[PDB]
Structures are given as C-alpha cells and as structure tokens.
Amino acid sequence: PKVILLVEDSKADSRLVQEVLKTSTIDHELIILRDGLAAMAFLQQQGEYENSPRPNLILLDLNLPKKDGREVLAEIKQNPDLKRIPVVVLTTSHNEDDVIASYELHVNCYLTKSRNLKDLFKMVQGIESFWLETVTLPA
C-alpha cells in the first residue's frame, strides 16, 4: 500500500484529508505530522522515526510551526534520497513569490486551499483521484 505523508498543523484540514482518503478504493496508509521538525525527523528517518517508512507521496502545507514548510520542500528536493518522492503543496498561502519559488524548487504541483470547505473537499478529492488512482507513484 502507498504511504502518504501529510504535514498539516490544521486539524480541521487534516480531518478533511483523512475523510477524503478514507473512502478511497486504492489501498494506502496515511501518516499525519503537525510541524516541519516532525516532518524532517521522519523523512530523515531519525530516532524518533528511525524505522519509519518512507512515503510514496507527500502532501505539504508551506506554513508550518517550528520549521517553515518552504524549508521542508527545499531540503526534500535537494536531498538525493528524497527528491524523487512527489510532493504536493496544499497551502493557505496565495502569495505569488511562493508559487514561483516552489515550482522552481521542483515541487510537483502547488494547490491553494479554498476558503470554502465545499471547494476544499472537492480539491482534496481531486488530489486523491489523480495522485492515488491515475498517477504511477515511484518505487
């Protein structure tokens, strides 16, 4: 099963992500982390997370506590062991600098969280149907 890593400090948002993936026909495991430090410790599979499984797909919000998500994305994609893992940025940040800088950093796609839940639920369903069903994730 595909291991999906979500780094989201918003509970309302991660709850909606869990709900969308909870009704997916594709098997998978969802690991949720709440800050940039946890995400990095995990990805670098260090102590707290030494035996931790690597993710086949990462959903990332740029605005995170402890360590900036913009930083997490850069280190993931500058690291030869993790750069191959598709990263999906899903964030509240509408800032133009962030959009460009992220794609230049090699983020796979950048998504902006709808203000209205109904649309966000639709957006997350789109992520699920595309990245978990149509896309062939790397090994």
Closest to its own copies by CB, 14 vs 91, is 91
Q: Enumerate residues 120-139 that contact its own copies by CB under 8 A.
A: 122-123, 126-127, 129-131, 133-136, 138-139
Show Cβ contacts of residue 138 under 8 Å, excluding neighbours closer than 6 positions.
Answer: 56, 84, 85, 86
Q: Which helix (H) or strand (E) holds 31?
A: strand 28-33
Which residues ranging from 41 to 100 are in contact with its own copies (CB under 8 A)? 77, 83-84, 86, 94, 96, 99-100
Q: How far is the CB of 47 from its own copies (least distance, A)?
A: 28
Query: What letter would DSSP give residue 15?
Result: H
Distance CA 122, CA 99 (A): 21
Q: What is the contact surface with Mn ion in residues (CB under 5 A)? A: 9, 61, 63
